[PDB]
Amino acid sequence: MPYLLISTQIRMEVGPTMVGDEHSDPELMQQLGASKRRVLGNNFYEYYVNDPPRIVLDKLECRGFRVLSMTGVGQTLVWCLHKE
Amino acid sequence: MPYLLISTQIRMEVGPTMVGDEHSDPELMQQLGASKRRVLGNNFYEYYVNDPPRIVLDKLECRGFRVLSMTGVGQTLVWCLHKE
Amino acid sequence: MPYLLISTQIRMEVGPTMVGDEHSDPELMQQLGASKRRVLGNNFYEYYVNDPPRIVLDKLECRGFRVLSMTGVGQTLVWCLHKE
Amino acid sequence: MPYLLISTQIRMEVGPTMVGDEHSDPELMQQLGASKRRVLGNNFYEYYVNDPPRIVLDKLECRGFRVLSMTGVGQTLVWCLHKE
Amino acid sequence: MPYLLISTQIRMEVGPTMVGDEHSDPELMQQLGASKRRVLGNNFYEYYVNDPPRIVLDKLECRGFRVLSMTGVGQTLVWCLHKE
Amino acid sequence: RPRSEEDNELNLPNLAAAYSSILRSLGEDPQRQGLLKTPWRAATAMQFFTKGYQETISDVLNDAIFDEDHDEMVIVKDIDMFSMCEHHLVPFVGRVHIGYLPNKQVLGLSKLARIVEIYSRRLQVQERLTKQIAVAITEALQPAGVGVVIEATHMCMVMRGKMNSKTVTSTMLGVFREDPKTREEFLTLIRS
Amino acid sequence: RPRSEEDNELNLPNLAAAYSSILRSLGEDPQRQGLLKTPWRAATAMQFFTKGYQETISDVLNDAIFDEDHDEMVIVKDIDMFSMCEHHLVPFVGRVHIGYLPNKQVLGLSKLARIVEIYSRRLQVQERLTKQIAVAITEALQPAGVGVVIEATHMCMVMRGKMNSKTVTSTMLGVFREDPKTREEFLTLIRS
Amino acid sequence: RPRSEEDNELNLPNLAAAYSSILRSLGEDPQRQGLLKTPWRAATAMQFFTKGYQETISDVLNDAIFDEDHDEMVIVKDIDMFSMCEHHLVPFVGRVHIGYLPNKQVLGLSKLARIVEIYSRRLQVQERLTKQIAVAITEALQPAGVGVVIEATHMCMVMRGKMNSKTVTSTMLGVFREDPKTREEFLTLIRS
Amino acid sequence: RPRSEEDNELNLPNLAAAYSSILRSLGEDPQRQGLLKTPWRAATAMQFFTKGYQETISDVLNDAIFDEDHDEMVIVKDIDMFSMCEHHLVPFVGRVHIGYLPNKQVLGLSKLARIVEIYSRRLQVQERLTKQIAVAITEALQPAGVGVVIEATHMCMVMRGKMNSKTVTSTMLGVFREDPKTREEFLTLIRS
Amino acid sequence: RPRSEEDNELNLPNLAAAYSSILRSLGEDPQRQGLLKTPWRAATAMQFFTKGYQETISDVLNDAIFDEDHDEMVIVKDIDMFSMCEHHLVPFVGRVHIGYLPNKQVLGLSKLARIVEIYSRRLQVQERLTKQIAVAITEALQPAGVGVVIEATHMCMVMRGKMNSKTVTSTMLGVFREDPKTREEFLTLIRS
Amino acid sequence: RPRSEEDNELNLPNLAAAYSSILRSLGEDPQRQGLLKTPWRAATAMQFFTKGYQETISDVLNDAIFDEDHDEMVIVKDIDMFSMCEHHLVPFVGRVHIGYLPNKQVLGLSKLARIVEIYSRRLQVQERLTKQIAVAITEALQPAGVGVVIEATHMCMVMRGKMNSKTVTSTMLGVFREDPKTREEFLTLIRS
Amino acid sequence: RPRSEEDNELNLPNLAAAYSSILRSLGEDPQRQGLLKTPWRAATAMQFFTKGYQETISDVLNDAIFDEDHDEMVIVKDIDMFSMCEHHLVPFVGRVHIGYLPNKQVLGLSKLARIVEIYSRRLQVQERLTKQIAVAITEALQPAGVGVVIEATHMCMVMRGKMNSKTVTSTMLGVFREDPKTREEFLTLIRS
Amino acid sequence: RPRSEEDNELNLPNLAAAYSSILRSLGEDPQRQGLLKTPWRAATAMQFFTKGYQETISDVLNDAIFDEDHDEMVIVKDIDMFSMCEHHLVPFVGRVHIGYLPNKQVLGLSKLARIVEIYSRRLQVQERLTKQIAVAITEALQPAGVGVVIEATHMCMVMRGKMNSKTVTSTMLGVFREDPKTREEFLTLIRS
Numbered sequence A, B, C, D, E: 001m002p003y004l005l006i007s008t009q010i011r012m013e014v015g016p017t018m019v020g021d022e023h024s025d026p027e028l029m030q031q032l033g034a035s036k037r038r039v040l041g042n043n044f045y046e047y048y049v050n051d052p053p054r055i056v057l058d059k060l061e062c063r064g065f066r067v068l069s070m071t072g073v074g075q076t077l078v079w080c081l082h083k084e
Numbered sequence F, G, H, I, J, K, L, M: 001r002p003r004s005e006e007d008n009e010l011n012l013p014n015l016a017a018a019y020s021s022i023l024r025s026l027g028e029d030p031q032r033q034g035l036l037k038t039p040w041r042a043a044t045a046m047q048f049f050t051k052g053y054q055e056t057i058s059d060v061l062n063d064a065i066f067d068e069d070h071d072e073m074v075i076v077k078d079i080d081m082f083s084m085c086e087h088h089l090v091p092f093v094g095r096v097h098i099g100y101l102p103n104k105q106v107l108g109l110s111k112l113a114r115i116v117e118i119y120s121r122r123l124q125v126q127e128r129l130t131k132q133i134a135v136a137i138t139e140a141l142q143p144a145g146v147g148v149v150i151e152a153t154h155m156c157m158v159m160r161g162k163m164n165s166k167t168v169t170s171t172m173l174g175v176f177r178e179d180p181k182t183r184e185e186f187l188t189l190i191r192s
């Protein structure tokens, strides 16, 4: 599992920060302190964290990930990280 | 065929994920488990997968591709990968 | 002439693909099979191709270009390539 | 703290430039001459500077940061920098 | 002054191209043939050029800059270049 | 357990009695010719206004759900609705606007109406009424998304000054929540 | 004897009790956080709607009645009015239009408003409300004539199908009754 | 003899059969999933549109007729009405406007609505519908006069080119017929 | 095989018979002067409402398709349309709004109208009608994109309470589907 | 002798020729792809606009005239009409408003429409068109009176500056002429 | 070569002759007092409707083009326009909306009007008319962009059923084509 | 003697000179590029606004006056009219409404327009303009009566605070003056 | 140097003399009783229309500029404005819409009005008027941005055919120019 996708909305200096989908690594999610849930109406689960994206990026570096690309889409700011 | 383009819409933690066009490598498409189709009104075929983009990115790494750039356009999140 | 800019609109799996401006390399444009034109109302010429961007990216690699960045702006998906 | 996020709005050749969140490095913020504040209605603090983003990028290089990715989202232009 | 930001609007194959702000290097601006101005209503000066961004990117390479990232924001296409 | 016709018959006298009591407590004469039948008419009226309790989405679910293999937005707007303020027991009136992106399954107008009827005919709070209708449609069609907008006037507020003042609530699910374009199109096609 | 503030305080608990009973008889839980204070709010709301009982035209009479020695038609239209249907205890809303041919004595807007307030805030029947307002004005001014027109929508009818359906009543006294020209002019100057 | 619920049950199959036959005669496939239940839904719909046959003014007469000793014009306007053209069996829709000069006896909105419902839910002709409502009100109140106005759009004419074209019919009895002033006032008060 | 004029002549008697049967099943007298010719008038009317079955897009295709080498959005809005609900055989009426991005080929108003006529004059479902018109236009012009929007009122729903309630359906093909800007502009240019 | 279908076929070529000539006289090229079929389309269009010449009130007379023994005013308003100015051969458009006091005999909407159709689809003058329709109705019903009002916009005038300017004509026969009250009521019931 | 006054004088008789012929082919009497001068009035009218042929953008070009060194969007909306359908020679009427982003040069209202006049007063096709007006403005100002929107009703379609149905065409050049924000703003400022 | 085209050519320079003078007297620079041609454009504009002096009712009289032996009221309303206040030389704009009871002779729209044009394009006073139009029509038709109503806004008043304030004038001759019924009908048919 | 009250008194005669001359050049009699005072009234009127010259933004600047430390968009819409066309000296009228993003400093309605007054009461060109108002506001508040929209009707164009045709100009500075979101919001809040 070398690729990771995290994101935040509206403002970057505050969370929540989406850190995973239904098929994400349970350990990594746990290490990040992420919670799981399925928003009413949505057909999928998501892992989130209340930390600002910066914090999550630092934590992810410790686990061996590096930011490859960052982009905006809608009101969502997304980061694509790669491990090994 | 060194370049690849995949994408997803509205939300990143869930599919479908567009993985190819009419002139895409049949084997790779097969390896990904992609289906082919032409949406009514459109003048082109497309290969898609029900997996979330993260999954497809991991699978693509195994076949030798690396994410060069990720960008948002409209409500579409796109990834440009390169092999060799 | 180390830098190149190409783009496509609305959908990525089909052309046309814009591959050059009025001051683009005639040979490269020819090698790509691009046509030249000036849309009524516009004050500039443009070189385009009916191929999907993926095809153009592969052809460009053969001529020594590499994608440095890809981004969306409006309904236009753009690629910035670099040669040497 | 290897990752940094800065941004500016509407126009890039003039500030203000957001350089930090509530959990940012106080020393770095001070070195940049940033001010802190919490806009009425917002549930978070932010560090800003009146310099244009270019100036902030140069100053950040001196402290060991490099721009990894730049992206637009809404009317906000964001830079993701990495140190070590 | 290792970082540079240039941009263009609406269409990429034609200028003008913004190449600097009030605190930009006068020599570089001169080398590019940029003009300075302050649009009525704006509280800042800007350096622009009538060349298409492609031309400016080539000229910039000669002076030692390399494109690190390209992104779209609003109807503005932006390039972030780095020297040394 | 949903309310039953028996419950109504067994409770009518209790309601009637309460209203008769209310008439006296107001300073009126429950004996006036004009007030004689009032306790029953009032009780019956209130039972009608709350007849939504004696029903469930299930009674509607199965019935009419044809498959025209449709997969594009369907909207039904300007659906009149009448409900009761649960805080003052005074009615609030307005219109409901619905939209959904079908996943092959489409909803008949008759069923849609019934859904709105079930939840609006109860002691309510506008936001709850909005969510219940949206969720009910979501469960009856398993659609890609659904949106519900309600605008209403509250008599409990109007009869204290207002008749022009309106409250607007909405509930967006699925693509209606995640895709700003869908939400915009929906709000454009209804705000006519 | 007109209702007093003491009566309200003495009866509020009775009203609150009746409403708490009604909540149970409907199948609701008087314990829900959303219903806890409902018996009192409802009771308070109902007292407000019937506060017209605790007043009389006398309390208004004397006060503001200036003599501008005016002897030509005076009209006050589009006066919002809220009342309660005495048959179902559901409100009926609308507007009141008044006109009168003064015999030197003119009525202040403030007093006029109070007169409409006094009779509308009671359990009513549109025709009676119309007559009472008209007679009240007649007694307060001893005018050459007076006309009152009311158009309303009955919630008790609307919430059973109507919101557009309106009832119009009128009472024409004095010259407003005997002179067709005065009646016509009045209807012309209000039907704008 | 008025139509009965039994008649409906006994004739539903006959209606269903006729509609199934019509489907075939039109070139359609009564077997399509979308048409399977059509013969019954069509039959039920047609029975609903003609349910006025199973009622009489009598069933309404007695009930609600209070005496507020009122003797001035009462109007109820903008009453929605839906009927069926007896020549083509296509519906014609519109509004009904009623007015009457009571002779002490007043008619409740509920009963008024029922009277309009009884005659409009039949195979009709706008002029007959107008007269029947007028006479029904006359018999139920023995008033000094009554007026009924109906404006409608005929689908059978519209779906052949019209949607804006409207037929207006009226029936004026008693003082509504003999007194031009009463007639005028009535038309003024409804044509708003 | 499309319905033919012969089919109509051969089936008219069957239709007539069915309607005469329906008249009896409702409790009416097929002998009344007013009902005598109804079986035929109803049958003819029903054949008119479904005359779209005796046609195909082909009969329209070739005719008027001029090439003004136009490549920008063309819109024809507020096209009146009358159809029949296939579930109750009651008509649903409204307007159709069309837009397309020509690929050199433009469609004449006459042909456009005919296309809407062919599919609307059948037993329909609003969503199907919408898609059929969109696809017909696509096949007749091979355009870069097309959009169709229909808003309608269902009589089968109206005559059960509604006349204001409207259903909005849409079908977006090509650039109309993929480009949110084209979709927005289209909705802006029609929602006037 | 009314115009016949044969006449049209025999004259189409003459009309086509005249238009082809007009095209040349204007400076246009009758050969352009866009103009090739114009001579015939123009000729056909003009025959359509004047098809009222090939009919008479007789063809309509007998058919639909039911006797509901109605003797009160019947009104059909907002009837769209299109005609041609006999002076410039440019169309003038508008609405027709009809009213009549039946002497037992009533006119069906279908026949009414045809009457307006017959006279309006001719080279006309608004006042003649108005009288002809009124007289036609008089002869077909032998009514106590009839009124016709037409309001139109003349293209021959609009395309020379106007689109808002309107001409209003009327023809009042029988009681509509002699009784000001009948006339007033009619104008009241149509000017809505 | 543009049409000249001489051409008109030399062709009037040919036109007149053709129209007189048309009158006979329709079944009319060219001798009626009301038709005597029709051939000339028709001929003159048709020359007026096509007077745009005797002009060119050049005659307007030079004149009024002041330089207020303006570089922001200028809009002129609700410009009435009357044209002729080249397929049926029946007029199509509507409004033209113009917008442009000046490159220092601004266009006077007078000239703008003339430009619309020149192309609309010809045998036309809505799309062509739209493009010609846009291109003419582009040539007379060398602007950064321009947009033209036309909405119209086609008499040739209306007088065959429609008056409410409208065709909307547009031509977007320069920034109006390439910048969605400019296009949106333009459509926002005209769709008022 | 009516003003002639020669007079205009001979006086244009005098007018131009006056306006050039006015420009200086105001503090402006007659030399500005924007003002250079103003003296002539202003002079020409002022001659256009007063071109009614170079004409007489005679030039219109004979021409178009057909005899349809019509003897019922004919109305032409909402005729735009622009004039100049003779006191401030600032325009006052509005609408003219005309009605007449023909004595066999009818007036063409073209002539009517010309009559309004002749008198309004002069330095005027609203009441005179009204009377002149009425008298002109009377002389051109020898009718049984005629009515003219003008409603206008005065720019000389508006540009000093008003744009909503309107002046209404009327001139009633013949039956329009003596018969209150005719007058009422006229005002009813125009005040729409 | 701004115009002064002395200038007016010294130039009034000049203006009056010029107008007296104009009256003669038109063919009128400067002696008519109705014309005697016209030369001065016209001169006074023209001075009023151009009184904006005798003022400067400075006279307004200092006065009312309170600091409510406001930093969100402030809008003042539907500001009536009257100006003069510098090419024909005919007035063009309309509304001004202003918006600005304050940088702590806010502008009083009184001052805003005066700014619009200063520039509109001059010989103008709509685009200049628009820019001058925008720049004036910018200088008076040093705001983050400002937007100005003006829609007007030109009498010089209207009195030559138009009254409905409107010209819309805008000037967006600061964030109003650079941020499309701000611009959109502004247009949304004014286009009501």
Ligand SMILES: N[C@@H](Cc1ccccc1)C(=O)O
Residues within 6 Å of the ligand: A008, A009, A010, A011, A012, A074, A075, A076, A077, D073, D074, D075, D076
């Ligand atoms: N909401 C910001 C953009 C943004 C979104 C999400 C994260 C960060 C920034 C804007 O409107 O410009």
Ligand SMILES: N[C@@H](Cc1ccccc1)C(=O)O
Residues within 6 Å of the ligand: A073, A074, A075, A076, B008, B009, B010, B011, B012, B075, B076, B077, F178, F179, F180
């Ligand atoms: N729906 C997201 C954008 C998005 C699209 C696709 C993937 C991820 C995000 C938004 O509008 O904020």
Ligand SMILES: N[C@@H](Cc1ccccc1)C(=O)O
Residues within 6 Å of the ligand: B073, B074, B075, B076, C008, C009, C010, C011, C012, C074, C075, C076, C077, I178, I179, I180
């Ligand atoms: N049209 C896509 C965006 C897109 C544009 C161009 C290329 C690819 C995707 C959307 O609205 O989401």
Ligand SMILES: N[C@@H](Cc1ccccc1)C(=O)O
Residues within 6 Å of the ligand: C073, C074, C075, C076, E008, E009, E010, E011, E012, E074, E075, E076, E077, K178, K179, K180
């Ligand atoms: N005008 C492009 C966006 C764009 C801006 C700048 C450069 C290139 C493209 C669009 O609307 O899709």
Ligand SMILES: N[C@@H](Cc1ccccc1)C(=O)O
Residues within 6 Å of the ligand: D008, D009, D010, D011, D012, D074, D075, D076, D077, E073, E074, E075, E076, M178, M179, M180
């Ligand atoms: N405001 C710019 C986008 C932009 C935002 C922020 C910084 C720079 C540019 C536009 O709308 O085109």
Ligand SMILES: [K+]
Residues within 6 Å of the ligand: A008, A009, A010, A011, A012, A013, A014, A015, A016
């Ligand atoms: K966030």
Ligand SMILES: [K+]
Residues within 6 Å of the ligand: B008, B009, B010, B011, B012, B013, B014, B015, B016
């Ligand atoms: K997805």
Ligand SMILES: [K+]
Residues within 6 Å of the ligand: C008, C009, C010, C011, C012, C013, C014, C015, C016
């Ligand atoms: K593409």
Ligand SMILES: [K+]
Residues within 6 Å of the ligand: D008, D009, D010, D011, D012, D013, D014, D015, D016
């Ligand atoms: K900034």
Ligand SMILES: [K+]
Residues within 6 Å of the ligand: E008, E009, E010, E011, E012, E013, E014, E015, E016
């Ligand atoms: K550019």
Ligand SMILES: [Zn+2]
Residues within 6 Å of the ligand: F085, F086, F087, F088, F089, F090, F154, F156, F157
């Ligand atoms: Zn409440």
Ligand SMILES: [Zn+2]
Residues within 6 Å of the ligand: G085, G086, G087, G088, G089, G090, G154, G156, G157
């Ligand atoms: Zn009631």
Ligand SMILES: [Zn+2]
Residues within 6 Å of the ligand: H085, H086, H087, H088, H089, H090, H154, H156, H157
């Ligand atoms: Zn019928």
Ligand SMILES: [Zn+2]
Residues within 6 Å of the ligand: I085, I086, I087, I088, I089, I090, I154, I156, I157
């Ligand atoms: Zn149905």
Ligand SMILES: [Zn+2]
Residues within 6 Å of the ligand: J085, J086, J087, J088, J089, J090, J154, J156, J157
């Ligand atoms: Zn004419």
Ligand SMILES: [Zn+2]
Residues within 6 Å of the ligand: K085, K086, K087, K088, K089, K090, K154, K156, K157
């Ligand atoms: Zn045509």
